[PDB]
Swiss-Prot record, chain A:
Keywords: Acetylation, ATP-binding, Cytoplasm, Isopeptide bond, Ligase, Nucleotide-binding, Phosphoprotein, Ubl conjugation
Protein name per its UniProtKB record: Glutamine synthetase
Gene Ontology CC: one annotated term: nucleus
Phylogenetic placement of the source organism: Eukaryota, Fungi, Dikarya, Ascomycota, Saccharomycotina
PROSITE patterns: GLNA_1 (PS00180), GLNA_ATP (PS00181), GS_BETA_GRASP (PS51986), GS_CATALYTIC (PS51987)
Covalent cross-link site, Glycyl lysine isopeptide (Lys-Gly) (interchain with G-Cter in ubiquitin): K263, K300, K339
Originating gene: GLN1
UniProtKB/Swiss-Prot annotation, chains B, C, D, E, F:
GO biological process entries: glutamine biosynthetic process
Record note on quaternary structure: Homooctamer.
A single Gene Ontology CC term: nuclear periphery
Name this protein carries in UniProt: Glutamine synthetase
Gene: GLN1
Annotated family: Belongs to the glutamine synthetase family.
Top-level taxon of the source organism: Eukaryota
Subcellular location: Cytoplasm
Cross-link Glycyl lysine isopeptide (Lys-Gly) (interchain with G-Cter in ubiquitin): residue positions: K261, K294, K333
Domain GS catalytic intervals: 88-336
Species for this entry: Saccharomyces cerevisiae (strain ATCC 204508 / S288c)
Keywords for this protein: Acetylation, ATP-binding, Cytoplasm, Isopeptide bond, Ligase, Nucleotide-binding, Phosphoprotein, Ubl conjugation
Secreted in keyword set: no
Amino acid sequence: RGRIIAEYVWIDGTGNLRSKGRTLKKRITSIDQLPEWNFDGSSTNQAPGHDSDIYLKPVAYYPDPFRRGDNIVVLAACYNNDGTPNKFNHRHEAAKLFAAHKDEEIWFGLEQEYTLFDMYDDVYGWPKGGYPAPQGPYYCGVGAGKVYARDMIEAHYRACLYAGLEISGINAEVMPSQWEFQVGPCTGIDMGDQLWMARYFLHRVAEEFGIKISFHPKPLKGDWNGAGCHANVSTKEMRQPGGTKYIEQAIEKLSKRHAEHIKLYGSDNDMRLTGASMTAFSSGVANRGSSIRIPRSVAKEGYGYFEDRRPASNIDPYLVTGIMCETVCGAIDNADMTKEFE
Amino acid sequence: RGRIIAEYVWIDGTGNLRSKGRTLKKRITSIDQLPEWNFDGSSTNQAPGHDIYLKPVAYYPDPFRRGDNIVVLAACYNNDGTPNKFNHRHEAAKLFAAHKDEEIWFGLEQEYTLFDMYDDVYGWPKGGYPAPQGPYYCGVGAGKVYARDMIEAHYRACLYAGLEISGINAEVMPSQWEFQVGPCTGIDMGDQLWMARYFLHRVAEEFGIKISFHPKPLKGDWNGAGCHANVSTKEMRQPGGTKYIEQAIEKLSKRHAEHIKLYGSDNDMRSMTAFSSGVANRGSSIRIPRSVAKEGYGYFEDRRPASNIDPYLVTGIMCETVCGAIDNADMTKEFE
Amino acid sequence: RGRIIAEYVWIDGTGNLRSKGRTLKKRITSIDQLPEWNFDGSSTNQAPGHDIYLKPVAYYPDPFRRGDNIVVLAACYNNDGTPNKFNHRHEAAKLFAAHKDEEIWFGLEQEYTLFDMYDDVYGWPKGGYPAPQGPYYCGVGAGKVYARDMIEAHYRACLYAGLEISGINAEVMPSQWEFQVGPCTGIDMGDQLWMARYFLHRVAEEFGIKISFHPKPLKGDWNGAGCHANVSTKEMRQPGGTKYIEQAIEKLSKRHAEHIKLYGSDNDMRSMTAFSSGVANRGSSIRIPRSVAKEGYGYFEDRRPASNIDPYLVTGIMCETVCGAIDNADMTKEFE
Amino acid sequence: RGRIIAEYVWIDGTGNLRSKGRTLKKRITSIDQLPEWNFDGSSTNQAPGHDIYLKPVAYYPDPFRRGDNIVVLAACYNNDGTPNKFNHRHEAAKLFAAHKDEEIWFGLEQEYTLFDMYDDVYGWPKGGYPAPQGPYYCGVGAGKVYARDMIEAHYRACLYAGLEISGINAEVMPSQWEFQVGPCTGIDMGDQLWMARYFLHRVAEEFGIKISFHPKPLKGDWNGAGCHANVSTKEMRQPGGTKYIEQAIEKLSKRHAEHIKLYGSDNDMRSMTAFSSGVANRGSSIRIPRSVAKEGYGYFEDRRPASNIDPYLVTGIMCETVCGAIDNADMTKEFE
Amino acid sequence: RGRIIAEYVWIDGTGNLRSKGRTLKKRITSIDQLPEWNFDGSSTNQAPGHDIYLKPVAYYPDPFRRGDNIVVLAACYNNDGTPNKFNHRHEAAKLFAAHKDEEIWFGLEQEYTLFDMYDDVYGWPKGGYPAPQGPYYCGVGAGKVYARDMIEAHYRACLYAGLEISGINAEVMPSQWEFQVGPCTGIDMGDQLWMARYFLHRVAEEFGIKISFHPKPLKGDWNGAGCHANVSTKEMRQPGGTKYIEQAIEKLSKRHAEHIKLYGSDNDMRSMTAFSSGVANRGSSIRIPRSVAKEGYGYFEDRRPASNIDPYLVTGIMCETVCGAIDNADMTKEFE
Amino acid sequence: RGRIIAEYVWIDGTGNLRSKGRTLKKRITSIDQLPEWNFDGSSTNQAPGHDIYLKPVAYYPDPFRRGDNIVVLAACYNNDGTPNKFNHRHEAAKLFAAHKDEEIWFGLEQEYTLFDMYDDVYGWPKGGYPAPQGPYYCGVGAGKVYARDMIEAHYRACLYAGLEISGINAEVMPSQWEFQVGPCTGIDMGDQLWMARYFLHRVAEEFGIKISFHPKPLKGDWNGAGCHANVSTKEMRQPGGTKYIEQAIEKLSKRHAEHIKLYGSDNDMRSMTAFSSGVANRGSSIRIPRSVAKEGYGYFEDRRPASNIDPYLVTGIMCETVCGAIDNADMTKEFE
């Protein structure tokens, strides 16, 4: 009725998004018009029940693919009443690094894999009490039994596009009712911001289909595929001719900090990077077995990007892209990614 | 077909809304054009069986009928001309009219809880319980929130009607929600919250969901349901306010019992006897938002009223004790 | 495709409507363009098996077929040219035509009750009962009202057809409703109520709901179903009316039995032998609205007729005894 | 295989029975052969988490395991040797032992109410209600009574165990029943009722029925649930009794509050403050059966105790105030 | 038809029993009459695909086949004559044979948890959870206990087979149970517990129930599942025992890690690194029953072993460290 | 009522049994008392439509009808007196009669697979699959095995009938089983296996389970279904046997193709062209049990025949090539 609804979305003290909505008097035209806000940090595992009580700083906003119209979704970062970034705010720390290395122009492209579930916490669409056929016909599948919940997956794609997210593509994965969507390329903090919104959209749209979304790295024990979030990386140098030079350089720095990265990179990733391997670091061209993979395409052309296949589906992009920049572009006395684990 | 439908909505002798609809010859452009009306007070627990009248008080576009169709909030007057037992709008109005100068503003945070057609908590495991509280507050994800589509429909409805609905959010207990309305001035708070409630019940009908304003729908550690009344006068809103805010809080401290007596039934299952206040304190009776405190002016949050409150009674007595009594009216007596 | 569908609706030898449809070459612009028609009276209990005719009486836009499609209310005439056993429109017409000058106005309050495809009360607990009466009258909220969407659809339908549908409301017994049609003049009351009924049955079809005009659908304390006929003549409507209102009420008091005899079957399960009247009196046979009384002119409410009444008979005999008999017609005899 | 199973049953720190079973080498022929035993009092709300003991008190044939298998009613003693918070059998015993000479007899009328696995009244219409009360009391016919087969199984069980179960009947509220145990002497009343309750819960398990000893399972006019304690001493039972019956009734009248304080929780939802008595009076606190009155001797009916009473407390304090206090024990204090 | 069926039951290369049946010409009267047998070790994870043998070790009446039909517990030996990877019965036997003189007795308390055909906790609310723990331990009443009939069937079965099954009880977590077997001597404990387990799985098949010996079937505060091993030697059982009991407890304290290493997988989700002991202490690693303590002789309870333990390994290493090692065998090495 | 029922069972022109029953005046005590009989060979694919005869061959107690009722295995002869296309019992008999002196013994291991009324694998996930093979072979526990009760009923049946049923076991593929019959002499092997099959189909009827003797019921890695024929002559069974065992194995190696041609249809989906032999070798065509090898005498296992084999053909040609051909009969020609 002349007014606008802004859904504030933020990240909690578990691995999830949270949101609430507020009416605004007028259409928004810049982040500056968006007010600070707050919530009960004790209901989200971010505060104690006194120094409890956390604040929301608008960071990005997009058209609401659900409410549509001039209604909007606002990505907000969590700051304690100190003014300090909450335990679970890692956007600030990463921002520091991206701001420092502005000049390198790091680009990221994440490949977000996820797995679909019943309202009853069983794999979505799988035979009651049993299993689908063995893997093989599901990857990039087409046909009634070959793919699950495509309509929900497509709705999400649409949503992301409407919001103007840099959603590059989508595909059905190897395990039945397991999917992927890719977002990129984004610069620095954008990668984190956009993937987090894409995730909000995913959860939220799936609600409408009674589907639960699982970012667990190994939703099903056994030979059923795990779920990763392959982080693709590049700096300005790597993108200009004679790049595999700096690509190779980066891969080597990366090889020295394998443990520090893995420590971010996702919980129970140990049931995925498994033997790819949790303790071993390797790299090579066209190698879906290595820790870092240089696309044959890149190799043949002498410039491009590399694929870090180590990060799990459940990673916090701020942490991954953050420490990636830290070790590829260089540390700062101003910030420590691995310490950002508070 | 050229004609208009007006749904008359009023408050009964239980804790509910009632309504009927009538055709009108032409589109309405002012409250003045809306006719008095009436109903059988004995079928709603407001009369004995030997007939009440409806005085249009506010009207809005009907979010359900849409078009030039309209919803009319009506107050109940007996054939005396006297306000029915359950009409507390009139009493409150007196106070608001007296203290016009102060310009009291209210913002209510209405919490409610969803239910089956079978009177079981909506969406809860059959015969059992969801996971324990924690992941539901402001939730997002399939199991984390219940009936969002209904909740959203309500939001939309309220906006269409032009209600001052400030926001919505999922609450701590699964299938428990909140919507906030404000700020409104004086009688508007009551009027608008009541309409928002009509819209809530009404829209939920379409989902087969019953709405519960009970203060403690589930015994145990499952959250209660409140209707936090936020309050401010012109003085409090201008710099150097926490002065008058503090003054108000103190007057309020002297009348804790009289307020509690309004403030909602079986609120006792949701401290009832203790009065306290403090900045950033979701434990106190009255809470001064840290934001307000840091800025020196604003409003305060009375966290005492239960979800099932009558806004006329709450906003009424709030004004009475914050702004000052009148020999012309007694809020606490308005309990007839 | 350039053509028009006209649904002919008529009244049968049970208490129901019947209909069939025919294509017409062109849009209709006056009753005169509508053709006579016919049907097998033996399949509707109006003829013996050795054929009845349909005389268009009124027509409206078809709320169901929409477009330039139309619904036609037809009266039943035997091959004699005589009005069928169950055509009481003609008899009544005589009276209305006689007393043209008085300008009788009617407003009927049609109550009805909803039912399963399985002939159980619609939406009621399986094998059991809802809570006891009280929260259903003018109800709002998920358990408080049944099939509102169907009821609304009907309201819309009537309005589209341009019927004089004045308002709707949920009644006292759960899944029992009312709609009001008025004011209509003379024969119009009958015509329009009958169409509204067609619309009701017809629209409810779409919800698998059966409509019951029985006066006492459930035995016990569950409310009955009436069709309160509201009445007024030109004199009663102009100041100093309650004079002629009172006069009418008295004439009515002398013909209580004759009226009751029309006024609906097993009305006895809904006092049948006593006649009384009084202002603001939902207990009397005729009720003068307090509003009317206070203002000195208006109308009166005859609370006697049952839900299942034939409006032609009620409005007919009402005129007969309020305005005056005719040697040209006998309402009570019209029972053939 | 030559061996015996003994199920030990005891009372917990909620209002329930608990049990476990143990193999015994040989058939049991006296209480003396039954071993002490124990359990984790912290898992039953009787100990803190830093262990309670079971003293065999009575034993009977197991109606469920049958054969030479047996059920053992055990009392709870802390490691002090002191009777647990919730062991009131010991305290009462003292009184019964003191007044051995009077030979108090009790007969309790245990009413209970049946429930779904889903905590809804057993067999009641889904989301709704049966017909109103009237046809259910001592009912017979398919709709008139609920779960008779379970009720009968329990009757059988009690008889097999050799309990003094005097009779059974269907109560006023649908799916509400009664069984009576008596007459029993002193401690036996408590022991046998508790076992009967074990048997009830246990047998109902087999029908997926939950048993409710709540005093008012359904709010409203639906009947509450009581445990009418019938009382008599040797004097009352011999001619010229209503003398001592009347005497007892008067002592009882002086200790109405002290009794009520035992007599069952939320009994307030089932008069609580008024004490009265009279012959053939289902309205009074104590009722003298017309039969007793006419014959001059017998017993009296205390209609005050609620369904959820602990027989040890009721029979205990009954004896205390009817037969006389002891410096050795205080029933009302036994509330630890 | 004159013939006998013997079901051979053995332990596999996962944590389960396996079995097949064979006809025998005549009733069996001693283990000596039972033939060796064999199976495809590659189908059970005990051989590579280039064949294991079954040596009858104990036999009982078949509670399922009944009659003169019999169940045969067989140990697995490779074609070397050597005990299979997963045969730990042989190693333990050595120790028991060595310390024949001490006459170790064991009593195991086997806890287990029930499951759907769909691998969800048996009987738990669909997608949700039962009420929180408290009312389930030794529960009685419809909601308080799950699948009692199956549990009872098992009890019966074990008794028929003549197993030393001492008792049964419902555990703290809903649909979690315990049965106790003892006291048994040396190798018997292992043999009998394994048979009891066969019976449990097998009988539950008939109720479509899966049995879980996992130590923590549900993450959170829901109880884990243990197999408390109770231990005693002849010395401990004769007066002045708590001497040797205390001695044993100390030896045990030195080998906490070595024991824990047997004692069950993911026992870590059920303190793992700390060793402690004390009288009446359900918190310690070893608990001396207050009863034992007060009487000066008896047994001790090792509360460390998890539900999924191999009794051969637990009782074996218990003897090794309590009674003394042998150069002839190493329990902790028996992990091949 | 004094009378007897004899069910005649025979083999048809598909791969199935057929049967009908007849009343007999008196209990049967020798095959001689059983009458010839007949049926419509055209309804079973054995005749053209221009009539076959049943010659009783063996009889047993009817495990289904019980009492003195009996099952009769009958062979099919055309009106010539010649053995039907599908009667291979006669041909085989010749060979067994010839080599009476050798006393061939057989033991068949009949594997089969269970199916829905809907032709889906019995008990398998709807539209999907169980876990991968491994836990099912000789399984025990709820998910590990399918329809054990049916399987057991069959075992019982076979025993009652007095068949030489040696044992049963659950196979590798879920809902796939085995039963073994042996040792039998010559024609008996065929007779008894065929009856066991009758019993299987018949008893399974009662569980709505279809039985599948197909060699590869599910394509893929799911196990096939075989009918391992175990063989031995008198010489092989007496010390120094593996001499003649080895001799037989070599003769068998020369006639691999001729055997395979019997041995079962689409056995190709279960090596078909390669012949090999070796001790303890579940990969070879013929396997000498390590047990036999170590002892120097015994039998050999031909692992080649498929589940769907005709035992008459297998045991027949086995004798033919192991014991020696006859000019009087040609097994491989017996394919008419």
